[PDB]
Design an enzyme around this catalytic site. Structure first.
Site, mmCIF file in Angstrom:
data_model
loop_
_atom_site.group_PDB
_atom_site.id
_atom_site.type_symbol
_atom_site.label_atom_id
_atom_site.label_comp_id
_atom_site.label_asym_id
_atom_site.label_seq_id
_atom_site.Cartn_x
_atom_site.Cartn_y
_atom_site.Cartn_z
ATOM 1 N N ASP A 338 38.524 31.600 30.501
ATOM 2 C CA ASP A 338 39.283 32.828 30.586
ATOM 3 C C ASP A 338 38.396 33.952 31.027
ATOM 4 N N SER A 363 35.971 39.564 32.628
ATOM 5 C CA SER A 363 36.820 39.081 31.568
ATOM 6 C C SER A 363 38.217 39.168 32.101
ATOM 7 N N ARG A 364 38.829 38.012 32.461
ATOM 8 C CA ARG A 364 40.088 37.989 33.174
ATOM 9 C C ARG A 364 41.212 38.511 32.317
ATOM 10 N N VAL A 365 41.191 38.182 31.001
ATOM 11 C CA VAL A 365 42.200 38.567 30.036
ATOM 12 C C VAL A 365 42.126 40.046 29.752
#
Lengths: 498, 187, 114
Positions: A338, A363-365
């Site tokens: 993620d 941090s994709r989230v």
């Protein structure tokens, strides 16, 4: 007939159910003829005393991977089916225990008070069985918390060149989890499971010593599979660590599992597969290496409100063997995870410790798993750092820099020094919110670069002395209100002359 | 080298056996013994067909051979040398396969041919005879060769017939014609 | 009784032996094939079934006649250890290659150890 009778005489006299006879063995991988009641993934007890699970079932030969050494196995022995797919004892008793892959206490803190057993492979929590990620997880490293926030359930990959204190970045997370652990309310606690696969017994011994020194083994579980210990046991090691984690998750307890390093898991599966003679894939890793990593990682989740609250959070660690981001084992993991927290070796030498390479770290989230206050202060922190990077490139082409560019440069330099922070020193959000406020609100820009670290130490001391009320509030409400912003602004101003 | 070469291992055995016994000109004897041992394998249906499975050693295998020549020492002897060979090469699962393969080679040497009349149902004996006659009449059976025309029931082929022999077939069946018909009406 | 075998193959220095009896040396046992070079010490590394092991040969493989008798030393190669190892130069299989006569040794220990 005399012939038929003699044939009965030479007959096996085993129906090869519950048993079968070894027929070639060596290279740590046996091959048995028989076992026609074999269950796949079952554990089979060799009569040498060795137990080895069985991973290959062929049209006459069950391929049983030894957990032991082959110097005790001898061809022609019988192996008798355990009749059980691999399972490990899981319980509360794992707290303060080092255990090997088969769950034997290798720290000799005696038997595990196990409240269950669980199975090595367990299907991941579904779409419906998860709720969205709310709660934060803090490592107490200013850069991690500010730049790449960690949330409960989320998978964030610590990636970067080998042994750049690779173990230490993760260990820092464990150390900051002392603050919640010491306290109360288990939903605010993270119990920590540190999994160390493929590392020398001495390395592990150092880890347990550090954890005992910081008294963090009052909440840690250490699942281990040292380098000497067999490749099948190493292959089995992340997946049984996961099972140990799921018991916490299932109980509704939020916990975090460090899988250090998966890169050695891949090597383990490579050995295993190539001596089960499955055709090898690119880089000599079979195709289901992607599958191997994916099934392991997706068993981390933040369970739906319906299904409690417990969230296993995962931090996989991949040690890049050249920094080649296109290497197969790194490529596979990057897709799965993620977020990625790329480190850079040069920056370690540059003295940035932790050596997080901010531009490669993502941090994709994204933010919704960091303190609201900390979200406010670090609002343009990402932008500033990125601008600093761009500016820094321009600066090294030696082109004349206008003052506006040098505003960026000056701000940028201070920020870089702000990021730095020596190992094994967590920092609470209450004391990261001021430092980041100071930086973003440009109070650091003035003060000389050399003594920024001194200023930081002192600034915190000053707030501890005078505006400790302000600090208590930042801790308690965790969001900077208008009043808090003004208080904080005044406080920074008050110590802006140091 | 002797006519008809059956490619493929175990038929490499058969070919060898065939050619060896053709050159020893004792093929009837071989064939007869092969039938007898094949029969005694079949008539040792448990504990001598259910232990053709590999697991036995070379040494345990040798004692299986001894049991085989114990059942009848009416064996040709070239096929006893073949039995030893099969034991040494440690295969005997394909033993009756080799026998069957030798049979194909042998009955090719005899000249005998096999055919087939797959149909959905067993046809008239008149049809069988007429086709056998016809095939013998036609150049299709060259003569000096015989036809064991076997109707087989394959309900999967709906009605029709397919005449088969010598890798040359004439297929006048309803299913196949139906296939082409369905297709022509998809245009 | 001497566990005899024959040399089925000599594919490089990875000789394969065929024990002719059901007494089967285990993996990491050591075998001596006696040669006009004294002997060759080999170490069992696979059992390829039907009493044909595949053995690493820890001494140079030259001139081996295929089908040459083997004898089983049993267990890993046992070196000679002591406080009398000091000053000695000890060979791969352990021999006094510094040639101050036979290494005086109390205890001889297996090469492989867990």
């Amino acid at each position: 007939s005399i012939l038929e009778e003699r044939i009965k005489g030479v007959s096996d006299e085993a129906n090869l159910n519950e048993t079968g006879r070894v027929l070639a063995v060596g290279d740590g991988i046996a091959r048995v003829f028989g076992l026609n009641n074999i269950q796949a993934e079952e554990l089979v007890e060799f009569s040498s005393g060795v137990k080895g699970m069985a991973l290959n079932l062929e049209p006459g030969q069950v391929g049983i991977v030894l957990f032991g050494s082959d110097r005790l196995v001898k061809e022609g022995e019988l192996v008798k089916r355990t009749g059980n797919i691999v399972d490990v004892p899981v319980g509360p008793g794992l707290l303060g225990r080092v255990v090997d892959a088969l769950g034997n206490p290798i720290d000799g803190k005696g038997p595990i008070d196990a409240a269950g057993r669980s199975r090595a492979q367990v299907k991941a929590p579904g779409i419906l069985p998860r709720r969205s990620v709310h709660e934060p997880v803090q490592t107490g490293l200013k850069a991690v918390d500010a730049l790449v926030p960690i949330g409960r359930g989320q998978r964030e990959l610590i990636i970067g060149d080998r042994q750049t204190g690779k173990t230490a970045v993760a260990l820092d997370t464990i150390l900051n989890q002392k603050r919640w652990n010491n306290g109360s309310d288990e939903s605010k606690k993270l119990y920590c499971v540190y999994v160390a696969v493929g590392q020398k017994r001495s390395t592990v011994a150092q880890l347990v010593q550090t954890l005992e020194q910081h008294d963090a083994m009052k909440y840690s579980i250490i699942v281990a599979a040292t380098a000497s210990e067999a490749a099948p046991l190493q292959y089995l090691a992340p997946f049984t660590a996961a099972s140990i984690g799921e018991w916490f998750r299932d109980n509704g307890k939020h916990a975090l599992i460090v899988y250090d390093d998966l890169s050695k898991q891949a090597v383990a599966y490579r050995q295993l597969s190539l001596l089960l003679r499955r055709p090898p894939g690119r880089e000599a890793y079979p195709g289901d290496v992607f599958y191997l990593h994916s099934r392991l990682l997706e068993r981390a989740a933040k369970l739906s409100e319906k299904e409690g609250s417990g969230s296993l959070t995962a931090l996989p660690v991949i040690e890049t063997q050249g920094g080649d981001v296109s290497a197969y084992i790194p490529t596979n993991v990057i897709s799965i995870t993620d977020g990625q927290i790329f480190l850079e070796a040069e920056l370690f030498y540059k003295g940035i410790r932790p050596a997080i390479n901010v531009g490669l770290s993502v941090s994709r989230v994204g933010s919704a798993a960091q303190v609201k206050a900390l979200k406010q202060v670090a609002g343009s922190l990402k932008l500033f750092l990125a601008q600093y990077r761009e500016v820094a490139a321009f600066a090294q082409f030696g082109s004349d820099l206008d003052a506006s560019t040098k505003q960026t440069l000056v701000r940028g330099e201070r920020l870089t020094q702000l990021l730095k922070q020596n190992q094994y020193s967590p920092l609470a959000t209450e004391e990261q919110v001021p430092l980041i406020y100071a930086g973003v609100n440009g109070h650091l820009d003035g003060i000389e670069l050399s003594r920024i670290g001194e200023f930081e130490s002192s600034f915190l001391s000053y707030l501890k002395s005078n505006h400790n009320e302000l600090l208590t509030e930042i801790r308690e409400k965790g969001e900077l209100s208008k009043e808090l912003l003004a208080s904080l602004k005044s406080a920074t101003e008050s110590f802006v002359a140091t | 080298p002797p006519p008809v070469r059956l490619f493929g291992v175990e038929g490499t055995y058969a070919t060898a056996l065939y050619q060896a016994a053709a050159k020893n000109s004792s093929i009837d004897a071989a064939f007869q013994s092969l039938q007898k041992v094949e029969s005694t394998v079949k008539k040792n249906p448990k504990l001598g067909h259910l232990l053709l499975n590999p697991a036995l050693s070379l040494k345990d295998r040798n004692s299986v051979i001894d049991a085989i020549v114990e059942t009848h020492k009416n064996l040709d002897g070239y096929v006893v040398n073949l039995l030893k060979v099969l034991s040494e090469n440690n295969r005997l699962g394909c033993f009756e396969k080799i026998a069957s393969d030798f049979g194909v080679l042998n009955d090719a040497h005899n000249g005998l041919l096999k055919g087939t009349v797959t149909s959905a149902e067993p046809l008239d004996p008149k049809s069988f005879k007429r086709i056998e006659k016809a095939l013998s009449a036609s150049k299709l059976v060259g003569q000096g060769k015989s036809l064991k025309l076997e109707n087989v029931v394959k309900p999967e082929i709906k009605g029709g017939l397919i005449v088969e022999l010598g890798d040359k077939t004439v297929d006048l069946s309803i299913s196949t014609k139906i296939q082409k018909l369905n297709k022509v009406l998809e245009d | 009784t001497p566990i005899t075998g024959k040399v089925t193959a000599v594919i490089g220095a990875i000789v394969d032996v065929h024990f002719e009896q059901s007494e089967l040396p285990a993996i990491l046992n050591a075998l001596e094939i006696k040669t006009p070079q004294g002997k060759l010490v080999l170490e069992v590394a696979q059992h390829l079934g039907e009493n044909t092991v595949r053995t690493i040969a820890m001494d140079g493989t030259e001139g081996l006649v295929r089908g040459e008798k083997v004898l089983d030393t049993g267990g890993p190669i046992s070196v000679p250890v002591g406080r009398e190892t000091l000053g000695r130069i000890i060979n791969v299989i352990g021999e006094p290659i510094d040639e101050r006569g036979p290494i005086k040794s109390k205890l001889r220990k297996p090469i492989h150890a867990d």
